[PDB]
Amino acid sequence: XKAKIIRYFYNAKDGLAQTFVYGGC
């Protein structure tokens, strides 16, 4: 692995989810 770490705060509501990810495996 995944050439992209993960950093979000979820947010379903119609299927939403602020996904602010940062580079990095």
d(CA 1, CA 10): 22
d(CA 9, CA 21): 10
Residue 17 makes contact with ligand C55 by CB under 6 A: no
Start-to-end C-alpha separation, the chain: 6
Which residues in 1-25 contact its own copies (CB under 8 A)? 4, 8, 11, 13-23
Residue 11 makes contact with ligand C55 by CB under 6 A: no
11, 17, 19, 24: residue in contact with ligand C55 (rule CB under 6 A):
19
Residues contributing to the site for ligand C55 (CB under 6 A): 4, 6, 19, 21
